[PDB]
Design a protein around this ligand. Sequence first.
Ligand SMILES: [Cl-]
Ligand SMILES: [Cl-]
Ligand SMILES: [Cl-]
Ligand SMILES: [Cl-]
Ligand SMILES: [Cl-]
Ligand SMILES: [Cl-]
Lengths: 144, 150, 150, 150
Amino acid sequence: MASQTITVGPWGGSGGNGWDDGSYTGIRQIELSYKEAIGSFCVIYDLNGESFPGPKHTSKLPYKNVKIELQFPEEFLVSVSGYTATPTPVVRSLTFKTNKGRTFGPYGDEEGTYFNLPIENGLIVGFKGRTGDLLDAIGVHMAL
Amino acid sequence: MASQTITVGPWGGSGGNGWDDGSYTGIRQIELSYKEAIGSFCVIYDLNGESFPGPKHTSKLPYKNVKIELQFPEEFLVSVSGYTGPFSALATPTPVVRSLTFKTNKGRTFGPYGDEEGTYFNLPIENGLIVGFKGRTGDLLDAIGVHMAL
Amino acid sequence: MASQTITVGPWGGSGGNGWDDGSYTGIRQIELSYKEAIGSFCVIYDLNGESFPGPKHTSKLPYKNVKIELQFPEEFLVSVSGYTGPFSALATPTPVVRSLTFKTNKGRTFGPYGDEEGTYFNLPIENGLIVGFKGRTGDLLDAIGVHMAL
Amino acid sequence: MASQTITVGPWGGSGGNGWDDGSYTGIRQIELSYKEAIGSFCVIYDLNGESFPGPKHTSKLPYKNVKIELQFPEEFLVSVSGYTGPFSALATPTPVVRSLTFKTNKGRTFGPYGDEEGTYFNLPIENGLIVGFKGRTGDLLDAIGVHMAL
Ligand SMILES: [Cl-]
Ligand SMILES: [Cl-]
Ligand SMILES: [Cl-]
Ligand SMILES: [Cl-]
Ligand SMILES: [Cl-]
Ligand SMILES: [Cl-]
């Protein structure tokens, strides 16, 4: 009231429109749109054993849709990696890896800088970012 | 993959059925019913700036209903106190939540609700926040506990 | 800056002088002295796998000394309970820690040490660890509280 | 009772001997050596308001030594960044920490130290604190990771 979490990032540029999904109990699924860059980014979180759709950050862009369906609570994200009209940095590519050894991605275009967040202990419990159009910047909330 | 929180309590007895609302961003409202003990207990949580109603832990008992509306996020609980002990109207012979009192950082006292008999319990919080309630409910609130986060 | 933890309590009075050991990795040992109240109270903490004696909060009252040696990391506290109230030997009628009891996840009970008189307090821990103690000491233990972490 | 923290990383390779300082209250000072890669890496932590030197991870290499003195508690790290990659001076193409840069909430930049060659890595902290370091050291700093807390 209001509880807080460890927040890392963002990786990308000053948008665009800033958004913060806040924090939850975990992640059950993630949905993205990809081609040149990452367009749409949405999350279906876990909230105390139930699914909870996070606010939509959709891009209208004609990009391919992907669905990352984790075996929650047995399977979780151990890493978020990727690449970062306007010369402002945007999210070009995203990769996600799990504790069970499954690699989802790379999606988009691996160009420009590069970012990597390996997680040894803890969990991603929420996403933060900037969506114009497309995904400009992305960040994570962490908790034990 | 399920995030966890510090969990303290429960205060009360092993009767009824165990429930756990889980954890959220904070507390907006507490609704309870009382008479000589605590009946119903339901919470409206904050979940990332929006109201999120927790599961209801309703009692069919003809008790008086009360709404504890906190001025979230400026105002939050700094203590949860009360009394637990057997209740003579029975048929449960194990302790039950007889009374509850909530105090905030703004200096507001809510309660006592119920009947102040049995063993007193007090959780003063010096640093951190209640983010969820856990308990046991039968015909009454048998036990109560809390999740804490920073 | 300075990292923080969840802090609960204190239980007891406002007498003596306030102290806070701060927070560490866990608890290895608790040393206390008792008779009709709690006198001395010192802790040997874990700090990243090494022992770290915290500050001493010694009483010069000839009480019985006891060493609570916890089998760290397998063994940890699941509850701190006790009694607070004024003590016959004045010149202050402020409530003091009259008794303490410690229970572990391995079903070990340490105490009650002291005199089980006044107001009982109980902190059952369902999820999390005590990582530090805070309190107040004058001639004896006036108040006690804990830091908790995951 | 072993308390845990969020641990991110490591960044770098599998060479050297793995180490973990564990977690503390905060960071007071960072001592490192550098030339074409990072050599030595030693931290002075804060432990409940007092300085606590962690274990040394000293490189035998004739490198340039530097002290990053942080104005704890008001000044703390908001960023750790650098470069990771193979080093031509080595018999193995195992990636090592080539460069390090540290940024504080007070707008102070420390570095870049070393060679800005290989794979760039960046850890911005929007909320929370670095409370400990973990890594791998042989002749050089092969890997680096961080413990985080609120
Ligand atoms: Cl291309
Ligand atoms: Cl390419
Ligand atoms: Cl007496
Ligand atoms: Cl007696
Ligand atoms: Cl007696
Ligand atoms: Cl007596």
